């Protein structure tokens, strides 16, 4: 079981990517459908869209899905191109911290609205 890979094994990675892909496609449609039904976006409409339990919960489920998905993803890429161990681990570290911060900042932004 590779330490940098999220999945315990290959199949695990296969699934996690496909599950999050799906959840992320719904969310995107959700966000797109809103913007294509907005026209002129007012501060009142914007905050109104987020003050919604539904939007908060979906937005955070997405960010969380991104962590899992982008992690496995960026990981596969680095495995192909960054062959020097030391360098690759630094990148994975930078990347995973970034993903975790995305989610943490997401919470901070959401409860603040």
């Amino acid at each position: 079981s590779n330490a940098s890979a999220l999945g315990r094994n290959g199949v695990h990675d296969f699934i996690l990517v496909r599950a999050t892909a799906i959840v992320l496609t719904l969310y995107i449609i959700y966000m797109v459908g809103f913007f294509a039904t907005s026209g002129e976006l007012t501060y009142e409409v914007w905050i109104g869209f987020f003050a919604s339990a539904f939007t908060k919960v979906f937005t955070l489920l997405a960010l969380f899905s991104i962590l899992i998905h982008a992690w496995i993803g960026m990981w596969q890429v680095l495995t192909d191109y960054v062959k020097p161990l030391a360098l690759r681990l630094m990148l994975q570290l930078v990347i995973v911290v970034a993903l975790v911060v995305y989610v943490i900042y997401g919470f901070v932004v959401v409860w603040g609205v």
Binding site: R18, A21, T25, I28, F35, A36, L41, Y43, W46, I47, F50, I66, A70, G73, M74, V77, I95, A98, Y102, Y105, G106, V109, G112, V113
Partner: protein, 129 residues
Amino acid sequence: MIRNVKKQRPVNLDLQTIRFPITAIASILHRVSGVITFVAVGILLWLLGTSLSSPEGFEQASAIMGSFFVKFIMWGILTALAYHVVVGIRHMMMDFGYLEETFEAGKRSAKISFVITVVLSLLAGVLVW
């Protein structure tokens, strides 16, 4: 050649020397689109951050999006993202079985994909505006 040990055989790897099918282009762009989108999220989170902080914030974001230079970038992000979703779905379909794994069926999938991407990309541009 390590220290006191020589000759390491050559390898044919000039990419300009290799002819790549459309299917090969399709997937490599999916990989590139992904890395673009990884970065993209941060940028979008930042904007979303400003956007909701307060009225003055929503103003500051509304105006940043005003820059036409920014409009271009906000435009590629959505196109890269759009490309990635489409080709991703194409991907998942062959996996399961809603698409043939033959080569021809493969080039057809690839082509229809780019088409839908271009279309969505156009729509994205209309929104950024």
